[PDB]
Amino acid sequence: TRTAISRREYDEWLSEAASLARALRYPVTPEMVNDSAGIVFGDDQYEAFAHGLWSREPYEVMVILESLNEPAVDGLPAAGAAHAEYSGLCDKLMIVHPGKFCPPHFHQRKTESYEVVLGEMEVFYAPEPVTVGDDDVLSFSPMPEGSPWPEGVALPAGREDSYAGLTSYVRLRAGDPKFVMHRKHLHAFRCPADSPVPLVVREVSTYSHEPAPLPQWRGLHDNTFVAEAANSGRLATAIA
Amino acid sequence: TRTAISRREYDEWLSEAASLARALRYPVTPEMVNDSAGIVFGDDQYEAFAHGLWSREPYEVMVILESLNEPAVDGLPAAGAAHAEYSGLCDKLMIVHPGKFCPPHFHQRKTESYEVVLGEMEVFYAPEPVTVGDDDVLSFSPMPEGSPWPEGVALPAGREDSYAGLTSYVRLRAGDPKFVMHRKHLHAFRCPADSPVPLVVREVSTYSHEPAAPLPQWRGLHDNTFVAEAANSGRLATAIA
Amino acid sequence: TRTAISRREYDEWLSEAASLARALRYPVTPEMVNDSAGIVFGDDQYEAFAHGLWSREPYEVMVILESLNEPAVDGLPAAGAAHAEYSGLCDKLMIVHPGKFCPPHFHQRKTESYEVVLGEMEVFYAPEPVTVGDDDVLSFSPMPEGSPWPEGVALPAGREDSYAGLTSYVRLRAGDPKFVMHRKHLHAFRCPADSPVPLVVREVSTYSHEPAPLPQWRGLHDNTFVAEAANSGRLATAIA
Amino acid sequence: TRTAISRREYDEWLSEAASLARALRYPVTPEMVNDSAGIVFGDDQYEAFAHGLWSREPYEVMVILESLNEPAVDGLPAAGAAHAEYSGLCDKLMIVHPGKFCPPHFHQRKTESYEVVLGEMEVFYAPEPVTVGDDDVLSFSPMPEGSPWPEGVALPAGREDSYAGLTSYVRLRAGDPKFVMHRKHLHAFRCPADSPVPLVVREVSTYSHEPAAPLPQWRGLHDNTFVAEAANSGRLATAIA
Ligand SMILES: O=C[C@@H](O)[C@@H](O)[C@@H](O)[C@@H](O)CO
Ligand SMILES: O=C[C@@H](O)[C@@H](O)[C@@H](O)[C@@H](O)CO
Ligand SMILES: O=C[C@@H](O)[C@@H](O)[C@@H](O)[C@@H](O)CO
Ligand SMILES: O=C[C@@H](O)[C@@H](O)[C@@H](O)[C@@H](O)CO
Ligand SMILES: OC[C@@H]1O[C@H](O)[C@@H](O)[C@@H](O)[C@H]1O
Ligand SMILES: OC[C@@H]1O[C@H](O)[C@@H](O)[C@@H](O)[C@H]1O
Ligand SMILES: OC[C@@H]1O[C@H](O)[C@@H](O)[C@@H](O)[C@H]1O
Ligand SMILES: OC[C@@H]1O[C@H](O)[C@@H](O)[C@@H](O)[C@H]1O
Ligand SMILES: [Mn+2]
Numbered sequence: 013t014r015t016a017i018s019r020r021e022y023d024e025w026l027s028e029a030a031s032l033a034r035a036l037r038y039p040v041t042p043e044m045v046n047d048s049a050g051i052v053f054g055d056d057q058y059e060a061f062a063h064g065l066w067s068r069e070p071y072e073v074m075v076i077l078e079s080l081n082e083p084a085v086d087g088l089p090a091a092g093a094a095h096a097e098y099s100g101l102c103d104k105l106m107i108v109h110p111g112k113f114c115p116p117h118f119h120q121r122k123t124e125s126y127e128v129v130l131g132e133m134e135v136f137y138a139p140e141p142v143t144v145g146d147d148d149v150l151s152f153s154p155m156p157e158g159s160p161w162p163e164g165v166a167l168p169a170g171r172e173d174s175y176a177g178l179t180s181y182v183r184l185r186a187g188d189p190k191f192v193m194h195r196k197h198l199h200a201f202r203c204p205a206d207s208p209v210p211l212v213v214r215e216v217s218t219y220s221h222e223p224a225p226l227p228q229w230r231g232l233h234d235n236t237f238v239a240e241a242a243n244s245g246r247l248a249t250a251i252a
Numbered sequence: 253t254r255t256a257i258s259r260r261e262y263d264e265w266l267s268e269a270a271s272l273a274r275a276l277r278y279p280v281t282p283e284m285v286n287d288s289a290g291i292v293f294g295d296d297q298y299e300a301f302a303h304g305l306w307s308r309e310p311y312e313v314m315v316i317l318e319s320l321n322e323p324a325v326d327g328l329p330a331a332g333a334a335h336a337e338y339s340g341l342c343d344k345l346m347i348v349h350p351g352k353f354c355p356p357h358f359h360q361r362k363t364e365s366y367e368v369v370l371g372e373m374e375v376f377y378a379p380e381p382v383t384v385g386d387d388d389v390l391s392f393s394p395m396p397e398g399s400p401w402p403e404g405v406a407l408p409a410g411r412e413d414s415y416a417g418l419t420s421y422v423r424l425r426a427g428d429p430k431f432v433m434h435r436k437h438l439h440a441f442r443c444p445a446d447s448p449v450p451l452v453v454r455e456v457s458t459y460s461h462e463p464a465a466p467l468p469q470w471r472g473l474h475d476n477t478f479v480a481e482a483a484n485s486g487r488l489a490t491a492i493a
Numbered sequence: 494t495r496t497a498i499s500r501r502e503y504d505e506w507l508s509e510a511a512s513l514a515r516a517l518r519y520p521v522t523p524e525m526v527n528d529s530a531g532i533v534f535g536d537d538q539y540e541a542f543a544h545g546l547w548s549r550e551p552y553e554v555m556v557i558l559e560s561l562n563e564p565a566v567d568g569l570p571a572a573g574a575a576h577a578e579y580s581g582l583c584d585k586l587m588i589v590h591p592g593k594f595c596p597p598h599f600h601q602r603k604t605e606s607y608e609v610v611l612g613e614m615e616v617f618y619a620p621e622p623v624t625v626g627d628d629d630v631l632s633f634s635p636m637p638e639g640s641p642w643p644e645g646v647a648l649p650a651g652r653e654d655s656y657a658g659l660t661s662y663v664r665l666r667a668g669d670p671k672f673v674m675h676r677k678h679l680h681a682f683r684c685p686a687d688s689p690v691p692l693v694v695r696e697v698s699t700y701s702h703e704p705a706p707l708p709q710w711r712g713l714h715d716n717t718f719v720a721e722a723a724n725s726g727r728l729a730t731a732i733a
Numbered sequence: 734t735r736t737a738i739s740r741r742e743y744d745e746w747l748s749e750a751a752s753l754a755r756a757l758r759y760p761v762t763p764e765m766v767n768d769s770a771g772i773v774f775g776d777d778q779y780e781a782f783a784h785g786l787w788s789r790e791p792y793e794v795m796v797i798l799e800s801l802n803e804p805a806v807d808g809l810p811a812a813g814a815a816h817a818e819y820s821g822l823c824d825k826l827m828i829v830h831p832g833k834f835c836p837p838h839f840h841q842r843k844t845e846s847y848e849v850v851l852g853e854m855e856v857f858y859a860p861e862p863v864t865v866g867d868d869d870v871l872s873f874s875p876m877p878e879g880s881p882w883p884e885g886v887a888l889p890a891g892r893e894d895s896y897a898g899l900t901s902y903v904r905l906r907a908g909d910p911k912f913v914m915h916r917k918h919l920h921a922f923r924c925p926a927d928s929p930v931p932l933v934v935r936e937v938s939t940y941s942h943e944p945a946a947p948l949p950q951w952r953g954l955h956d957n958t959f960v961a962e963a964a965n966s967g968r969l970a971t972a973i974a
């Protein structure tokens with residue numbers, strides 16, 4: 013079983029991803045292409061490189077090219093310091109290959125939106141938010157119900173039940189209006205296994221806490237995965 | 253001197269703007285192409301159409317196609333209600349023709365970022381922030397010093413001194429790193445007058461308050477403060493004949 | 494009735510066309526943007542600028558940005574001089590606004606192909622070639638039958654019967670395979686009147702004879718329009 | 734030293750190539766992504782995958798996605814049958830990775846043009862034509878003189894002198910005027926070795942004869958003559974393990 017990805021496989025992965033990104037006019041800088049851009053969600057997912065990114069096999073692995081992760085703390089009244097972590101601006105291009113997924117998870121603080129650039133994106137999510145603590149939460153425009161999953165979706169082996177709670181589905185195509193994923197909502201997405209191209213999606217959200225513009229923000233991790241295996245990994249991609 | 257834009261001029265202006273957007277892969281739907289997407293900053297700026305958007309003359313006129321303006325209030329602890337207006341998510345595509353400007357102004361709440369898609373953007377701004385609302389504010393990444401103004405910038409007739417406070421300059425090209433314009437900073441920008449194409453830039457920012465409200469204290473909130481008196485009002489509607 | 498287009502209308506027309514072309518990555522050089530790029534097929538078509546390119550009214554007017562018109566006569570055996578005019582390479586981007594058309598016509602010598610870049614293109618043509626002289630003509634892959642015209646197509650006023658012979662129809666969208674229009678076939682096309690964007694199509698064909706790499710090629714005009722009004726015009730755009 | 738490319742390497746190579754093409758708006762259909770679209774010019778060039786298409790090493794390997802190859806014989810006077818093979822219409826997208834080459838060769842019949850879509854193209858060619866077939870040929874626009882070779886070009890090991898006859902050089906960028914390579918002229922090109930992206934260029938040319946024929950005399954017609962012996966054969970198939 014694969015426990016890491018070779019330097020060649022990794023470099024070819026991100027190079028082709030950065031090139032596709034540039035072809036689509038996303039502003040890729042050299043610093044955006046690094047050994048952290050290629051994400052493998054769990055040690056058992058490294059097996060995705062056994063057959064490769066074009067095997068069309070179900071695995072939770074992806075590339076994220078982040079052009080912006082602005083705290084937007086400057087000018088903010090000190091009184092709002094306690095909730096600043098729910099704000100900020102983040103812009104990133106995500107590239108997922110055929111059959112691959114961004115594993116089930118939710119953000120206590122981050123609210124995101126999706127803009128499909130190339131290919132089509134199948135989103136799986138829970139329309140009802142998850143109750144974190146309990147404390148009064150604000151409401152305005154709740155998540156739409158969506159539709160039931162279409163048949164045929166193959167989930168990664170050993171991670172399928174972590175998708176159980178994400179009963180809602182939506183298929184986004186390039187040109188569609190922005191789709192918002194409010195914080196506290198479990199969600200995951202994939203590139204259709206029969207896709208001729210990798211899914212390229214622009215995510216515009218609030219700050220992405222993933223280890224200090226603020227003392228409280230130190231060591232903050234705003235990504236909680238349903239599967240415990242997904243947590244450990246993606247903390248540093250193992251490249252041999 | 254004219255005080256309005258003909259229906260034909262407005263439609264061609266916005267239709268080409270929306271076509272260019274779609275060509276650049278921006279998500280445009282019909283509701284986005286409306287009567288307030290084409291902004292003329294002041295009644296004296298309607299003169300821009302006397303000769304047209306390709307005359308290369310300096311005027312404060314532009315088109316804004318907004319694909320997103322999410323309050324991002326859902327899920328926020330009730331405790332944060334007071335400053336939620338400083339957050340939110342906004343995504344828009346701005347199109348500025350050769351020599352045209354987005355006039356000097358600042359936002360009390362909105363922090364924005366720039367991504368040039370087509371053409372080049374000349375940004376004029378003030379590195380020092382003003383103080384509006386609260387006088388006890390946070391600080392992390394102060395605005396960069398930028399560069400002195402380049403030579404040969406033509407400013408709008410009658411509006412020249414409104415640019416005096418924008419002493420820093422930076423020219424942004426497609427592919428450059430995102431440029432952040434922190435809230436409470438005076439800024440403006442233009443498409444070089446000698447550009448062969450309109451400037452097309454994506455603005456990713458916090459919620460855009462521009463008159464059911466996400467929150468009661470959000471009703472009628474004005475977040476755009478223009479340096480020039482004549483521009484703060486004008487933006488509030490486009491005279492179409 | 495309009496008898497010309499103003500300099501402002503013309504300059505705005507081609508400027509916005511060149512910009513859209515550049516946005517789509519077509520290689521536009523300054524010399525490609527000239528007072529001949531904007532075509533009006535007949536003096537009576539200048540009325541298209543009465544209400545403008547976004548009136549969605551039926552008129553035969555368009556912009557052609559030609560990046561290549563190579564005779565390809567160099568290296569060609571002298572023995573082939575007599576038929577060289579049927580060869581050559583031409584690459585041009587055509588921009589047609591909503592409801593507008595490229596009038597009915599055929600080329601004795603030029604064979605063309607279409608690649609839709611933006612919008613959708615509705616092609617109207619005669620599946621049977623026109624017999625020019627008579628002389629033995631070669632055959633290989635004749636034009637497909639196509640489909641009958643969909644309902645609702647509005648033709649330019651006073652030119653509608655010139656479309657009578659173009660009984661076949663096909664709708665090309667961006668991403669579709671190349672569509673070939675063999676020489677000697679009458680054809681015309683338009684941008685759907687309800688289109689949100691101008692139709693942008695890349696035409697790759699054999700040499701476009703439109704007034705000398707060869708003595709015979711001097712003064713050669715390979716565009717014959719069904720409507721006599723279309724002929725006279727487009728020989729020089731009247732710009733006031 | 735290897736003599737083939739694994740199935741995985743071939744599929745990733747072509748899938749990324751086709752994805753980049755689609756991103757660049759080129760019309761790609763499934764039949765175009767096949768076992769002969771990935772070309773390795775000679776058995777010794779399979780070594781390119783020992784380290785991969787991103788090693789930046791000099792090898793003669795490339796991908797060609799052909800969207801059109803029209804004989805354009807329909808409608809042609811029977812009198813022109815003899816030289817119809819010099820006409821036709823071909824449209825293909827070529828993808829060359831950093832440092833890789835499309836080896837030295839010439840075409841008796843094919844005249845081609847270049848349009849760089851992504852990256853930059855370094856073209857090496859001979860301004861003087863060879864004489865093949867007929868010795869009485871036409872002339873109108875002789876090949877431009879171009880420039881001397883730039884410094885630092887790394888050529889494929891064992892293939893260096895095959896480039897001796899290509900004394901002219903021209904570097905083409907996206908947006909440049911179309912570049913025509915007349916038939917019967919030796920030429921080759923590469924993607925700069927320091928390029929961050931693969932070279933993507935559209936070739937618009939006359940019919941591509943590369944083994945029902947449009948005409949009987951077209952059957953088995955070979956129109957690619959490679960300078961290096963080892964490359965003329967290799968192109969005729971891709972060893973996939
Ligand atoms: O939708 C996924 C986003 O949150 C994405 O930015 C994030 O999940 C990525 O860091 C992987 O955990
Ligand atoms: O810098 C300009 C941006 O704030 C832009 O979105 C703004 O000018 C627009 O809302 C009009 O005032
Ligand atoms: O399909 C139309 C092409 O022949 C186009 O290049 C030509 O018609 C144009 O010159 C208008 O007559
Ligand atoms: O210059 C290269 C072109 O002729 C290209 O199409 C050709 O090399 C290809 O057919 C492979 O030989
Ligand atoms: O629940 C099992 C299957 O899971 C898949 O993911 C779904 O697409 C559907 O085919 C279900 O029947
Ligand atoms: O893409 C939106 C469309 O843009 C076009 O440019 C407009 O004329 C109108 O048709 C809108 O609906
Ligand atoms: O022939 C009249 C009409 O012409 C139109 O062009 C066609 O689309 C169809 O609606 C016909 O009925
Ligand atoms: O666009 C064509 C497709 O390209 C993809 O890259 C290939 O994997 C295969 O799915 C082809 O059918
Ligand atoms: Mn997420």
Ligand SMILES: [Mn+2]
Nearest residue numbers: 357358359364
């Ligand atoms: Mn602003």
Ligand SMILES: [Mn+2]
Nearest residue numbers: 598599600605
């Ligand atoms: Mn034609």
Ligand SMILES: [Mn+2]
Nearest residue numbers: 838839840845
């Ligand atoms: Mn060649």
